[PDB]
């Protein structure tokens, strides 16, 4: 069908343009954290691991894109990277909720726990899916997504995101009270919108692609655009609109003009 092929090709073009642009900004943002040792904080080191995951997720998707038992194994890596990326968003949501609300003071005491949930925990659902799919189904390249056996890997991922949505509700509820005790609506809408990409709350608010074709197509365009540029929108708000790194970048550039020549 020509329209479907044309529709898929534009999205394929969007995926390549969206991810390559996102990975380019992300490495610069991740590079800033490692290069500048002044920015060392508890959230920042946690942020550093998340940024590499975005770098890791974007490269694997693009390498998956060019190819579309070795085919299966690369997909298994893709399943783990996709799953771990969603879990890491839960880990940052867990950390931010604990830092703001539950234990207000500095929470580097449980950093080992986060790594197990962030990296060690995604291995168990993905390994269950890889073992189960081969025996029950034996799919080629694991390139079928319509199967009913994908629930095992994606059941925790959806569960992680929905509880993450609950965390955002607490943060806004805390934030509005703070503003009131001190134009509050503008800051509140801005605060929730910037929070959405890092926590990954675009998925939960738009969970299912609707049955109507007119509604589905616009839904397809908004979902693809946000997800492909999600790593780009995490890198801009948290490394360029972030004020403390903005001051650090400015002073470093000043030195670069005088000592060069």
């Amino acid at each position: 069908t020509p329209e479907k092929l044309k529709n898929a090709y534009v999205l394929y073009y969007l995926a390549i343009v969206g991810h390559s642009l996102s990975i380019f900004t992300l490495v610069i943002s991740l590079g800033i954290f490692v290069f500048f040792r002044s920015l060392g904080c508890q959230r920042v080191t946690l942020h550093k691991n998340m940024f590499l995951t975005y770098i890791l997720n974007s490269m694997i998707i693009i390498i998956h894109l060019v190819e579309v038992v070795s085919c299966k194994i690369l997909h298994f890596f893709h399943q783990y990277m996709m799953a771990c990326n969603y879990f890491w968003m839960l880990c940052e949501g867990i950390y931010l909720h604990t830092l703001i609300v539950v234990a207000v003071f500095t929470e580097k005491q449980r950093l080992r726990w986060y790594y197990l949930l962030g990296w060690g925990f995604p291995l168990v659902p993905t390994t269950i899916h890889a073992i189960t799919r081969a025996v029950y189904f034996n799919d080629n390249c694991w390139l079928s997504v319509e199967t009913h056996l994908l629930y095992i890997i994606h059941g925790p991922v959806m569960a992680a995101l929905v509880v993450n949505f609950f965390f955002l509700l607490n943060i806004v509820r805390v934030l509005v009270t703070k503003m009131r005790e001190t134009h509050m609506y503008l800051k509140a809408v801005k605060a929730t919108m910037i929070l959405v990409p890092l926590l990954g709350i675009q998925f939960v608010v738009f969970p299912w692609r609707p049955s109507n074709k007119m509604l589905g197509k616009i839904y397809d365009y908004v979902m693809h655009s946000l997800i492909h540029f999600q790593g780009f929108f995490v890198a801009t708000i948290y490394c360029f609109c972030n004020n403390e790194v903005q001051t650090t970048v400015k002073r470093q550039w000043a030195q670069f003009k005088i000592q060069w020549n």
């Binding site: 069908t1 479907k4 092929l5 898929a8 090709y9 999205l11 394929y12 995926a15 998707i61 998956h64 894109l65 579309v68 996709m82 969603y86 390139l143 079928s144 997504v145 319509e146 199967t147 009913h148 994908l150 629930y151 994606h154 991922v157 959806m158 995101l161 675009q202 998925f203 738009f206 969970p207 299912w208 692609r209 979902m223 693809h224 997800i227």
Partner: peptide, 19 residues
Amino acid sequence: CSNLSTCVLGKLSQELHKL
């Protein structure tokens, strides 16, 4: 995965691959 938002890539890759 049953056309969830969680696996946008899965349905994107599959349709292009078929066609």
